[PDB]
Scaffold this active site. Structure first.
Site, short mmCIF file in Angstrom:
data_model
loop_
_atom_site.label_atom_id
_atom_site.label_comp_id
_atom_site.label_asym_id
_atom_site.label_seq_id
_atom_site.Cartn_x
_atom_site.Cartn_y
_atom_site.Cartn_z
N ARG A 52 -74.96 -21.04 -32.53
CA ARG A 52 -74.63 -19.65 -32.81
C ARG A 52 -73.18 -19.51 -33.23
O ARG A 52 -72.87 -18.77 -34.17
CB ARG A 52 -74.94 -18.77 -31.59
CG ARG A 52 -74.71 -17.26 -31.82
CD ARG A 52 -75.32 -16.39 -30.74
NE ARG A 52 -75.09 -16.92 -29.40
CZ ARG A 52 -76.05 -17.40 -28.61
NH1 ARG A 52 -77.32 -17.39 -29.03
NH2 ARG A 52 -75.74 -17.88 -27.40
N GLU A 59 -53.67 -31.99 -28.87
CA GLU A 59 -53.57 -30.73 -28.15
C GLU A 59 -52.38 -30.74 -27.21
O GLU A 59 -52.22 -31.66 -26.39
CB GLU A 59 -54.85 -30.46 -27.37
CG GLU A 59 -54.72 -29.47 -26.23
CD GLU A 59 -56.07 -28.92 -25.80
OE1 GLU A 59 -56.30 -28.76 -24.58
OE2 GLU A 59 -56.90 -28.67 -26.70
N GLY A 106 -62.37 -17.99 -22.94
CA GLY A 106 -61.61 -17.80 -21.74
C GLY A 106 -62.52 -17.54 -20.56
O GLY A 106 -63.72 -17.28 -20.69
N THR A 163 -52.59 -24.75 -26.61
CA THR A 163 -53.49 -23.95 -25.78
C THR A 163 -52.89 -22.56 -25.49
O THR A 163 -51.75 -22.25 -25.84
CB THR A 163 -53.81 -24.66 -24.47
OG1 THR A 163 -52.60 -24.88 -23.73
CG2 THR A 163 -54.48 -25.95 -24.75
#
Ligand code: FAD
Ligand code: FAD
Lengths: 289, 285
Positions: free
Chosen positions: A166, A23, A114, A54
């Site tokens: 979910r 990342e 976010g 990001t």
């Protein structure tokens, strides 16, 4: 004794295809822009599964993420995944972002909610909503966030684990954890993920600790516990980066050795755009040129 | 397994037990090496080691040079500095001169070794000799993986007890990487009745080609995993220092957990790894 079971664990790490993802964050000055591309060309020879970039929620540097992700695919040929956030944009905007990513060549998106500014009423939009919207558009491999120590805004640890299931149901097929230092609590959480019915690896996010005061900043927003011995391990090192980097290598390689013994074969590194520690940890994992 | 390294790290961070460390330097043979040595000495001195020590090239004749570094360390820093001395190249009367002159400098500890000619003179003989000149603290060498010239492990052990009974009171090991074997060796020393710590010589592995060289002379074994951990890093000093950190601090954490509170660092004149390793043990300015 400990002596016989660190010599076994060193030899086990000395046959498995380990997968690694890196990342990066979008830089903001010519110093950091150079530090990032240094790292990208250094790390590419380890043939990572993907690299990710990001996304500034409301940072306005939303356009920087898309351009880097394209430049990585260009100049290195590594598969590159943008992160994408929900709270900043309407569904039409997100559908347009998703459409163009896909016509670009991007096949993996890292889909996050976010955070609203601190003190703001939360918008009833969540990550599972962004996952459904992205799957409306095309067959994205989608990576979502897990919180081994529970997300700070969750109703309960049960509700946060149900939320992760979910997000998988909506179509995400890859899971990356928040960083952590309690290895035992990650393993326990990983098993709870297999109990609820989640079939991809809960991939640990490994954060090398090269600046402790920065870590205290990041870990306050995020609910991750900083063990006492880690605070002690860094006291007095505020002006000693060289010692910090060595203390950090031992800490991270200890983690990664232990996860590897417990059958984790997937690692996501928060490189913070540096390459020293991530290259060496991968090296000790057998992930080498 | 995870709760094993977590409680390991929390016993390293919680122990108020005074840990005695000591640093070994070698005499520099150029101007570069000299700058390196002296930055190391001023960087490691804050940690208050029990002593520092300076090696001796047996047939080199640099013994005036080893003695010079030692006098200089004491004057500039206050550290207790200890010369390495070998009796293999010197007549017994010369050795007694060297000891009296060391003693009038204020030296109180000598590391006393045979050395190797490139003579029926062994190290217990140098210990008897030093002790007849004055009441030196004397440190001697122990070999957890048997000294290459011993007929047997039990005989090399009998030898080490001979050097203690001859007047020595400090034991320092050749470097090692099989820690379980070191621990079993320290058990045997206890049994045969040696009443000092069998102090580990920690050698941080900053360069694996150099380690390959040091280790061939010495009958010290390089684990398969250690070779693997350095494969492909000939030109990667950065990765080697990080790999070396994890290797040393595992070894030192386990030794510390098993009750070893005394460490001797083969600094190779560099301070980066030793300062970090001491920092993690709780040895701090
Ligand atoms: C690997 C990783 C990468 C990240 N990358 C970025 C990035 O690029 N940019 C950025 O700004 N942030 C990023 N973040 C941070 C992330 O946006 C925050 O952690 C945020 O607070 C939660 O995001 P989420 O995607 O996990 O949201 P969600 O999975 O939706 O969950 C957030 C919270 O809402 C709760 N919740 C979920 N559904 C509901 C519901 N229906 N009703 C009520 N509560 C619900 C959950 O239990 C949890 O407390 C990243 C985090 C991780 C772990
Ligand atoms: C911490 C440390 C520091 C060192 N510093 C130096 C240095 O500054 N300079 C240098 O040149 N070398 C140095 N050495 C190397 C050392 O001198 C060599 O290992 C040497 O080969 C033996 O030294 P020793 O003091 O252990 O000798 P000894 O204790 O005498 O052992 C030598 C060998 O002879 C055997 N032996 C002992 N007594 C007898 C006997 N009566 N009859 C038959 N065999 C016997 C022993 O079992 C052993 O195999 C150091 C080694 C260590 C571990």
């Amino acid at each position: 004794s400990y002596a016989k079971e660190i010599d076994t664990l060193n030899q086990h790490i000395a046959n498995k295809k380990i997968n690694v993802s890196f990342e990066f964050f979008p830089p903001k000055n010519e110093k950091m822009e150079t530090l990032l591309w240094d790292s990208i060309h250094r790390l590419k020879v380890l043939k990572p599964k993907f690299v990710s970039v990001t996304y500034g929620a409301n940072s306005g540097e939303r356009d920087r993420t898309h351009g880097i992700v394209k430049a990585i695919k260009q100049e290195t040929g590594l598969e590159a995944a943008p992160h994408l956030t929900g709270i900043d944009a309407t569904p039409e905007e997100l559908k347009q972002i998703a459409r163009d990513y896909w016509d670009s060549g991007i096949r993996r998106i890292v889909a996050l909610r976010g955070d609203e500014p601190k003190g703001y009423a939360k918008k009833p939009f969540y990550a599972s909503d962004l996952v459904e919207l992205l799957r409306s558009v095309a067959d994205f491999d989608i990576s979502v966030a897990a919180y081994p120590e529970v997300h700070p805004e969750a109703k309960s640890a049960q509700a946060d684990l149900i939320n992760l299931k979910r997000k998988i149901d909506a179509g995400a097929n890859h899971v990356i954890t928040q960083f952590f230092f309690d290895i035992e609590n990650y393993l326990r959480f990983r098993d709870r993920c297999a109990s609820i019915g989640i079939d991809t690896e809960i991939v640990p996010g490994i954060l090398p600790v090269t600046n402790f005061k920065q870590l205290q900043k990041m870990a306050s927003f995020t609910n991750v516990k900083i063990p006492a011995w880690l605070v002690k391990a860094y006291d007095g090192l505020d002006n000693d980066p060289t010692t910090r980097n060595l203390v950090a290598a031992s800490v991270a390689m200890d983690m990664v050795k232990i996860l590897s013994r417990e059958g984790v074969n997937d690692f996501h590194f928060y490189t913070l755009n540096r390459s020293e520690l991530t290259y060496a940890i991968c090296h000790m994992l057998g992930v080498r040129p």
